[PDB]
C-alpha cells in the first residue's frame, strides 16, 4: 500500500550500482525474444518444410536451434550475474550502515536480545530485500517482454484467431472460478458435518471398565457399526460432489476449444491459416499462461521484500546514545564522586540504586562489596554512562559526567575482566586494541612484561605475533586476565574499573595476577567490583552494598570490627 | 521390501468388493484412450484440414472434441466413485474389526493412551491405507494405459522418428542428471564455507561494552567492512556457478532437438512424415513425460500405504484378555475372599498391594478407607479381573476368580459411580444398559423410583423417554449417581462395587442418594471405596489401607477407639 515510500527511501543506495541493472534488463529482454523466436519457427517447420516437402528447411533449422540456445544461455548468465552483483552490493552496503548505526546505539538496546541472533535476522532480512525485489524486477522485465512478444506474434500470424482466443480465455477462466468456488462451499459444508460424526465416534471406546462389568460389549459394537457406516456413507456423499467438479471444468474448456475450431471452419478465418500458423498461434497462446501467472504474483513478492526492508529502516530510525556533552577531557586528574544518585533500569520500577553518595579520590582505590544482586555492577556501568541516572549527579573533576562528550569520558576509563574482548588477531594488537600504530612493539612488550605475561607468551609460536583463534581460542582464564591488565596498563588510563566478579580465582599463578594488579593500581583512581581478599583488604576504602544502597563504609578492620554485613561477607569469602 | 506380505494379508477384506475395482479399471483405461484419441486428431487437423484446405474437417472436429470430453468426464466419474465405494467399505470393515478386537483387549492396553487419540490415529491410518493403495492402483492402470497408448500411436505414425526419440531421451536425461549432480556438490562446498564466514560475522557485535570503554569502534567497523565484502564476494562465487548449470542443461537438450531435426532431413525418415504426423509424434512424446513421472512414485505410494496397514495389523495381532476360565456362575451366593494377594501394576516394580487378606461375607458390606494413593481403587479393579495377581488367590464361592469365565464373573459384579457410562440414548435404555428388551418399562420405572430419580425424571421432556445428549449432556453430578444406582438396582447383581472417591458430596438431595444407597446395599455383598461418613460408619466392617497394605480392620467405634490411622482419616473427613 505504502511500499513505494519504502522503495523511494531505499533507492539511492541502489542507484550507485545502476549500470548493472540496465545490462541485466537488456539481457533479459534479449532472453525473452530468444525464447519467442524459437517458438516462431514452428511456422517454417510445418509450411516451408513439410508443406513444400523441402528438406533444405530441416538443414538450417538445427543451426538456428543451437544458435538461439547459445545466445539464450549467454543472456541468462549475463542477467543472473549482473543482478547478483547489484543485490550483493546493496545488502553489503545496508549491512554495513546497520552495523555502524548499532555500534552507537544505547547499551539498553543490546540487553533486550543476543547480538548473535539480531545479526542472523539482519543478514537474512537484508538478503530477503534484494532477493524478493530483484526477483520481481526479473519477472516484470522478462515475462513482460515474453508477453508482449507472444501477443505481437499471435496477432501477426492470425489476428482473426487471436481475437477469438483473447475474448474466450477470460470467459473460460471466469466460468471455471465460478464453478470451482461453488464446489469449495459444498466441500466445507460436508467437512463440517464429517468432523462432528468423526468426533462422536472417537469417543465411543471410553468408559471401557463400566462396559466390561455390565457386559455391554455387544451393545457397543452395534453403536460403532452404525456410526462407522454413517462415516463411510458421508465419505461417498463427499467424493461424488468433488469428483464431479473436474469433468465439468474440462467440459467447459473443451466447448471453448470446439468453438475455436468451428470458427476456423469459416473462410473469413480459415483463409489466413495454414498448418504452420495454427500451430504457432496455439503454441504461443499456451506459452502465455506461465508468464501471466508469474506477473500476478509480482506484487506479493515486491511488498514481501519491502516488508523486510521496513524492519531494517526501523533499526536505522531508532535513536542513538545521547551525547549532548560539550566538554573535552584530555586526562582526568581523578577525583570522582556520586552525589545522591538514584537509578532505575529502563522498563522496570523499583530502583537498582538509591541515594548513592560515594567519593573515589585521585590515586585511591575503593572496593565495592556485597551479595550477588546488590548493585555492585550497576554502579560501575553508570561511571561510563552505559545508562543515565534518574536523580542526582556523578562528577569527574567537578563537572557532571553528562557535560562531557561520551568519547572524552570513556577515554579516561579502562576495564579489566576475565571476559575481556579478545578477537581474531596477534597478541600485540589485542593488547593495543585501538591505537595499534600509536604504541611500538618495544612499549607493548613492556606492558606485557609488567602484566606477568611474557611468562606464557615467550613460551608460544612467534611470541607476541601469535594469532589468537576463533573468538580468542588459545587462552586460559588466568592468561586472559593478565592480557586485560596489559591492555589497561598500556593506555595509561586515569580511571580503572576492575571486575573480579566474573574472573576465576583457583588459577595457578594468581600470585602473578595480584603482582600485576598491584602494579596497575599504583597511583591511579580505581573502582573495583571486588572478590579477592587480596585487593579488598588492601583497599583504601571499602563500600558495602545491599539491595541497592550503601550500608557500610570504611577500611578493612574498621568494618570487620562492626560485626555487620561486611563481616557476614568476609566470613563467606564473597563468592 | 516385504509389503506384499502385508497386501496378501489385507487382500481378502477387499475381495468381497472386487466388482467395483474391475469397473473402475475398465473406466480408467477408457479414460486413457479418450485422452490419447484426442491427441491423435492433430494429424487430421493439420493434414486433412489445412493440408487439403478442407473446411469440412473443422466441422466434424468440434463434435468429436465435446464427444470425447463427455465420455472422458463420464469415465472419470465412474472410476473415482467406484474406487471411493470400495476404499470406503474396506476402511469401515477394518475399523469395525479393530474396534471389536480392542473391546476385548486387557485393561492394561487402555491405560497407556487415551482411546480418543488412538481412534484418531486409527481412523486416519485406515484412510491412508486405502487412499495411498487405491491412488496407486489408479496411476498404474491409467498411466500404464496412457503410456501404452502414446507409444503405439508414436511408432505407428513414424517408427523412424520414434526410435530416434526413444534412444535420445534416456541419453539426454542421464546427461542432465550427471551435470546437475556435479553442481549440487559445487554448491554444498560453497554453502559450507559461507556458513563459517557468516557465523564469524554474526559474533562481531559482541563485547560492546569493552569496545565503548576502550574506544575501539573505528577498529570494529573495519573488521566488519572486510567480512561483509568477503561474504558478498562468496555470494558471487556461488551465483556464477549455479546460474551456469541451467544454460548448459538446456544446451544439452537443444542438441538432442537439433539432432532430431537433422535426422528428419534425410528422406529415409522424411518420407514417412507430414505436418500432421510430426506434430502428433512430438505432442504424444511430450504427453509421455507426466505419466512416466507418476509411474516412478507408485512404489513409494503403495508401501507408504502398506506401512500404515502394518500398524493396524500390529493392533489386531496384539493379545487379548486371558480367559482360560472354564466355570460358569449363574449367581454368586456372595462369599468373597482375598488370601495373601500381592500385586504389581505391569511395567513397574514396588507392588501396589502386599499380602491382602480380606473377606467380604455374603450380604455384608466392607468399606475400604485410606489416603489418596493407598490401593483402595486397585483392590476393586482386581475383583473384576481388570488385572491379574502375582501371588495368592481371590475367591468367589470357594474357587479362584481365574477358574471362572470373565463374562460369568463380571455378570455378578455391578458398579456405581458418578463417572458412570452415560451415552446418547433415552433414560430407560441407559438404566437398562444391555438387556433393553429383557426388562419392561414397568420394571425400569420401579428401579428409577427406588433410586430416588422419578423426582427429576417426571420433571422433564417425555419422562423416561428423554434423550441424554452428546456424552450424556443434561445430568448434574447427583442425578448421574442415582441413575448408576438405578442401573445396579435393575440388575439384581449379587456383588456391588461402590466408588465414592470420584463422586461429589455437596449435592442437594444427598439425603435422596443415601436413601437409595441404603436400598441398594440391602442383603447384597458390597465392597465400597468409601468417603461418605454415612456409609463408612454404617459399614459391617471397615478396612484401612495405607501404602498398599491393610493396617487396621473392625467396626467404626472399635477403630476410632484405637486412635490410629482410621482416627486420623475420620478427623480429616476422608477427602
Amino acid at each position: 500500500l505504502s511500499t513505494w515510500q519504502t522503495f523511494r527511501r531505499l533507492w539511492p543506495t541502489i542507484a550507485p550500482f545502476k549500470a548493472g541493472l540496465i545490462v541485466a534488463g537488456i539481457a533479459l529482454i534479449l532472453n525473452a525474444a530468444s525464447d519467442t523466436f524459437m517458438l516462431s519457427l514452428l511456422k517454417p517447420l510445418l509450411d516451408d518444410g513439410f508443406g513444400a516437402t523441402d528438406r533444405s528447411v530441416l538443414l538450417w533449422m538445427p543451426l538456428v536451434v543451437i544458435g538461439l540456445m547459445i545466445l539464450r544461455g549467454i543472456t541468462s548468465y549475463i542477467s543472473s550475474y549482473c543482478i547478483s552483483w547489484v543485490s550483493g552490493k546493496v545488502v553489503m552496503t545496508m549491512r554495513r550502515r546497520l552495523f555502524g548505526h548499532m555500534m552507537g546505539m544505547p547499551v539498553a538496546f543490546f540487553d533486550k536480545q543476543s547480538t548473535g541472533t539480531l545479526l542472523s535476522r539482519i543478514t537474512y532480512d537484508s538478503e530477503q530485500v534484494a532477493s524478493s525485489s530483484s526477483g520481481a524486477l526479473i519477472t516484470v522485465v522478462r515475462e513482460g517482454a515474453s508477453i508482449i512478444g507472444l501477443f505481437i506474434m499471435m496477432f501477426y500470424y492470425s489476428w482473426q484467431l487471436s481475437i477469438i482466443l483473447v475474448v474466450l480465455a477470460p470467459i473460460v477462466s471466469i466460468a471455471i472460478r465460478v464453478v470451482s468456488k461453488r464446489f469449495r462451499s459444498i466441500s466445507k459444508n460436508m467437512q463440517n458435518t464429517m468432523g462432528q460424526v468423526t468426533t462422536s465416534a472417537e469417543q465411543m471406546l471410553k468408559g471401557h471398565k463400566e462396559v466390561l462389568i455390565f457386559g455391554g460389549q455387544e451393545v457397543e459394537t452395534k453403536r460403532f457399526d452404525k456410526v462407522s457406516n454413517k462415516m463411510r456413507l458421508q465419505g461417498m456423499k463427499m467424493v461424488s460432489a468433488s469428483s464431479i467438479s473436474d469433468p465439468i471444468i474440462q467440459l467447459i474448456a473443451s466447448l471453448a476449444l470446439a468453438f475455436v475450431l468451428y470458427a476456423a471452419s469459416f473462410p473469413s478465418v480459415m483463409d489466413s491459416l495454414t498448418a504452420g500458423t495454427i500451430t504457432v498461434v496455439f503454441s504461443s497462446m499456451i506459452a502465455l499462461m506461465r508468464p501471466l501467472k508469474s506477473l500476478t504474483n509480482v506484487n506479493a513478492q515486491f511488498q514481501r521484500g519491502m516488508a523486510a526492508c521496513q524492519t531494517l529502516f526501523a533499526i536505522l530510525d531508532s535513536e542513538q546514545e545521547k551525547d549532548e556533552g560539550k566538554r573535552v577531557i584530555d586526562r582526568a586528574t581523578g577525583d570522582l564522586e556520586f552525589r545522591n544518585v538514584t537509578f532505575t533500569y529502563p522498563g522496570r520500577e523499583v530502583p537498582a540504586l538509591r541515594n548513592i553518595n560515594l567519593k573515589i579520590p585521585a590515586g585511591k582505590t575503593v572496593a565495592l562489596v556485597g551479595r550477588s544482586g546488590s548493585g555492585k555492577s550497576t554502579i560501575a556501568s553508570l561511571i561510563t554512562r552505559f545508562y543515565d541516572i534518574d536523580e542526582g549527579h556523578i562528577l569527574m573533576d567537578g563537572h557532571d559526567l553528562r557535560e562531557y562528550t561520551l568519547a572524552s569520558l570513556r577515554n579516561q576509563v579502562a576495564l579489566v575482566s576475565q571476559n575481556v574482548h579478545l578477537f581474531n588477531d596477534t597478541v600485540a594488537n589485542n593488547i593495543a586494541y585501538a591505537r595499534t600504530e600509536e604504541y611500538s612493539r618495544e612499549q607493548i612488550e613492556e606492558a606485557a612484561r609488567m602484566a606477568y605475561a611474557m611468562d606464557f607468551i615467550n613460551k608460544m609460536d612467534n611470541g607476541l605475533d601469535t594469532i589468537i583463534g576463533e573468538n580468542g581460542v588459545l587462552l586460559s582464564g588466568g592468561q586472559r586476565q593478565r592480557i586485560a591488565i596489559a591492555r589497561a596498563l598500556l593506555r595509561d588510563s586515569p580511571i580503572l574499573i576492575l571486575d573480579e566478579a566474573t574472573s576465576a580465582l583457583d588459577t595457578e599463578s594468581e600470585r602473578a595476577i595480584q603482582a600485576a594488579l598491584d602494579e596497575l593500581q599504583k597511583n591511579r583512581t580505581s573502582l573495583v567490583i571486588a572478590h579477592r581478599l587480596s585487593t579488598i583488604e588492601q583497599a583504601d576504602e571499602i563500600v558495602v552494598v545491599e539491595d541497592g544502597i550503601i550500608v557500610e563504609r570504611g577500611t578493612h578492620s574498621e568494618l570487620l570490627a562492626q560485626h555487620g554485613v561486611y563481616a557476614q561477607l568476609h566470613k563467606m569469602q564473597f563468592g
Side-chain angles (χ1 to χ4, degrees), chain A:
Chain A
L1 296 155
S2 72
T3 72
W4 277 86
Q5 300 187 325
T6 320
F7 188 81
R8 276 314 285 187
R9 178 93 169 284
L10 177 60
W11 173 246
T13 63
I14 307 158
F17 318 125
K18 181 175 59 159
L21 293 178
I22 282 155
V23 171
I26 270 168
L28 285 167
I29 287 163
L30 265 167
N31 198 272
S34 195
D35 199 45
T36 80
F37 275 115
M38 184 128 319
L39 204 45
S40 93
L41 54 62
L42 294 175
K43 190 260 192 292
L45 183 71
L46 307 197
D47 294 349
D48 301 27
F50 296 92
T53 323
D54 176 350
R55 72 183 295 285
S56 92
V57 148
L58 295 148
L59 254 52
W60 59 259
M61 191 85 76
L63 297 161
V64 181
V65 154
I66 74 184
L68 290 179
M69 286 307 313
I70 275 158
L71 173 138
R72 190 227 181 74
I74 282 163
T75 58
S76 177
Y77 180 73
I78 288 152
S79 84
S80 59
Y81 185 96
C82 287
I83 287 299
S84 92
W85 181 81
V86 175
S87 43
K89 298 267 280 211
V90 165
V91 303
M92 190 207 55
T93 289
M94 277 296 286
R95 282 169 190 184
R96 289 176 171 185
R97 191 169 161 198
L98 272 168
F99 180 96
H101 189 80
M102 287 179 292
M103 186 82 80
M105 293 273 290
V107 181
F109 180 74
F110 284 70
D111 297 325
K112 311 189 82 170
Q113 64 212 318
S114 170
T115 68
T117 71
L118 182 65
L119 288 187
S120 86
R121 288 178 76 165
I122 280 160
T123 60
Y124 173 82
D125 285 357
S126 49
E127 192 65 12
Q128 271 281 322
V129 167
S131 150
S132 288
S133 49
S134 80
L137 178 68
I138 285 163
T139 53
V140 168
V141 167
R142 205 210 164 281
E143 307 319 74
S146 206
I147 273 157
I148 291 159
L150 300 166
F151 269 123
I152 279 165
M153 196 179 67
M154 274 175 76
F155 281 99
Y156 177 78
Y157 282 124
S158 165
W159 68 265
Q160 294 102 335
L161 192 61
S162 301
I163 281 303
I164 297 162
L165 299 178
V166 158
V167 172
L168 264 178
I171 296 154
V172 182
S173 86
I174 278 154
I176 289 165
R177 273 172 169 279
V178 153
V179 168
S180 97
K181 184 78 194 148
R182 189 178 86 198
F183 278 103
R184 281 182 237 287
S185 72
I186 296 166
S187 189
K188 262 197 161 194
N189 289 18
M190 291 180 160
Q191 282 178 1
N192 194 51
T193 71
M194 184 75 163
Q196 292 168 39
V197 171
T198 302
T199 307
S200 160
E202 290 169 4
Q203 290 307 282
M204 66 177 71
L205 206 41
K206 289 188 154 148
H208 182 54
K209 278 173 267 161
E210 279 265 343
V211 171
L212 293 183
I213 285 166
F214 281 114
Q217 294 96 350
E218 206 221 345
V219 167
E220 294 304 310
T221 59
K222 292 175 179 180
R223 293 171 73 270
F224 196 78
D225 276 359
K226 290 207 174 158
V227 87
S228 72
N229 193 87
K230 190 193 175 190
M231 269 193 297
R232 179 196 67 92
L233 224 55
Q234 188 69 2
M236 315 282 57
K237 228 161 189 298
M238 283 186 68
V239 167
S240 87
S242 72
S243 77
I244 279 287
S245 170
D246 221 66
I248 282 166
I249 280 157
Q250 291 178 309
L251 191 76
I252 284 158
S254 102
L255 291 160
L257 172 71
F259 177 84
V260 169
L261 297 180
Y262 186 71
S265 91
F266 300 120
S268 6
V269 177
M270 204 182 168
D271 287 2
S272 75
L273 300 195
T274 69
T277 79
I278 205 188
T279 75
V280 145
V281 175
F282 284 170
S283 292
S284 55
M285 183 256 197
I286 292 161
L288 275 179
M289 293 186 309
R290 192 201 304 154
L292 290 167
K293 204 211 169 175
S294 283
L295 283 186
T296 60
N297 307 354
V298 163
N299 211 40
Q301 204 186 42
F302 190 64
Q303 73 197 13
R304 177 191 94 191
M306 293 300 92
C309 201
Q310 212 64 51
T311 73
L312 304 189
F313 284 127
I315 293 173
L316 292 165
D317 281 306
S318 50
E319 207 202 328
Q320 293 200 320
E321 267 172 323
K322 303 269 184 168
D323 194 27
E324 294 145 58
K326 302 287 150 44
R327 302 183 64 83
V328 179
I329 292 283
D330 297 322
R331 191 180 179 82
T333 62
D335 254 62
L336 194 77
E337 192 207 304
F338 288 53
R339 186 185 287 243
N340 199 33
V341 161
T342 313
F343 166 76
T344 46
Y345 278 127
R348 303 182 209 170
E349 260 156 25
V350 171
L353 299 173
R354 277 162 297 164
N355 312 121
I356 305 298
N357 304 278
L358 158 53
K359 184 152 181 166
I360 316 171
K364 306 291 179 131
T365 111
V366 169
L368 301 171
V369 164
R371 263 209 226 81
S372 316
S374 297
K376 286 203 287 203
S377 15
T378 305
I379 288 177
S381 65
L382 293 159
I383 304 271
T384 54
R385 268 172 85 202
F386 295 174
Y387 298 81
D388 257 317
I389 52 162
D390 313 344
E391 193 191 64
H393 305 276
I394 303 180
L395 280 60
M396 199 169 75
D397 299 23
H399 301 86
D400 200 302
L401 284 187
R402 294 166 292 199
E403 283 191 67
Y404 298 120
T405 75
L406 270 171
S408 175
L409 164 59
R410 286 153 175 173
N411 197 31
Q412 312 321 313
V413 183
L415 181 63
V416 170
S417 199
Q418 173 150 298
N419 324 317
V420 74
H421 189 64
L422 299 171
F423 60 107
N424 206 281
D425 209 309
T426 59
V427 169
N429 295 292
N430 255 240
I431 284 176
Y433 181 54
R435 302 142 171 74
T436 53
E437 94 298 13
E438 308 180 33
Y439 293 122
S440 65
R441 170 58 59 85
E442 293 182 347
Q443 288 164 289
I444 293 164
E445 190 159 345
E446 184 59 0
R449 199 201 79 73
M450 293 184 296
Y452 291 68
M454 298 307 287
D455 169 45
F456 66 87
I457 293 166
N458 285 336
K459 201 188 174 176
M460 195 49 194
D461 309 317
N462 319 288
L464 287 164
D465 309 311
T466 320
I467 313 310
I468 322 159
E470 284 289 327
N471 216 308
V473 172
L474 316 189
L475 297 174
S476 69
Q479 295 165 312
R480 288 199 179 175
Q481 292 201 57
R482 286 175 271 168
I483 295 283
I485 289 157
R487 187 182 287 173
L489 255 158
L490 185 58
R491 288 189 226 198
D492 207 351
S493 49
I495 304 174
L496 161 68
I497 294 163
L498 167 52
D499 192 331
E500 299 181 327
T502 65
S503 68
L505 300 158
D506 305 77
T507 161
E508 284 296 308
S509 76
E510 184 134 305
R511 287 186 154 280
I513 296 168
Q514 291 169 201
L517 283 181
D518 275 308
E519 192 53 52
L520 175 57
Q521 272 144 303
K522 218 154 199 151
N523 296 60
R524 80 165 79 265
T525 318
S526 2
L527 184 59
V528 178
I529 301 156
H531 293 271
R532 287 191 176 85
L533 286 148
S534 88
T535 59
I536 293 165
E537 294 182 348
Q538 285 183 78
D540 296 49
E541 185 170 45
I542 288 170
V543 179
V544 187
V545 177
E546 189 155 65
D547 289 21
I549 187 155
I550 294 169
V551 288
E552 295 170 22
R553 174 187 278 94
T555 78
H556 164 56
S557 41
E558 188 178 351
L559 288 176
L560 190 53
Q562 291 174 14
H563 296 291
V565 300
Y566 176 81
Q568 174 49 42
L569 302 171
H570 190 288
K571 191 193 174 180
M572 298 282 269
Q573 287 174 117
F574 309 103

